[PDB]
Amino acid sequence: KVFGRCELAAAMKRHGLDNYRGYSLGNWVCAAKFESNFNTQATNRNTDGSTDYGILQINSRWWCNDGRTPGSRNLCNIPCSALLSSDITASVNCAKKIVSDGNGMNAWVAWRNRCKGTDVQAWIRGCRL
C-alpha cells in the first residue's frame, strides 16, 4: 500500500506515535517519507547483508527475522515480511521499541539527515487530525 500523507498521519496518531518519547507526529511522517516514500512494500539491502523493510525501513540486523541475515537478532519477534503489510501495526509497535533503545530517532539515518532540525510540523499541515 502507498499511503497518503494525511492518511498515514492519522493512522500513526491512532497507534500512539504522536509525541511518543517526545517526537511530534511530523517527525514520524517525515521519516516515513524519506525512508520509504510512504510505501509499505519498500525493501532495501544494506552493505552488511541485512535488509530494511517497510514504511519505516526496519532492519533485519536487529529487529526482525528474514531467514537470510545470519548472526542477527529479532528484537521485535516478527518475521520481516510482517513489516510489509498494508496494516502498519507491526511497523509502529516495532518502531516504538527502536526509538526507546537510547538513540531516539537518530536510529533512522534518513530522519537524522533530512528531518532533524527542519520544520517537521509542515509534514502534517492541512491534515484533519
Q: Which residues are known binding-site members for substrate?
A: 101
Q: Answer yes or no whether residue 72 interacts with Na ion by CB under 5 A.
A: yes
The answer to whether the beta carbons of residues 50 and 72 sit under 8 Å apart is yes
In the annotation, is 52 catalytic? yes
Q: Which of 7, 18, 35, 119 is catalytic?
A: 35
To Na ion, the closest distance from the beta carbon of 68 in angstroms equals 9
| Residue 81 makes contact with Na ion by CB under 5 A | no
- Quote the least distance from Cβ 80 to Na ion, whole Å: 7
Give me the 28-67 binding string for Na ion, x by CB under 5 A, dash otherwise. --------------------------------x----x--
> Would you please indicate which residues are annotated as catalytic (active-site) residues?
35, 52
Q: Site residues (CB under 5 A) for Na ion?
A: 60, 65, 69, 72, 74
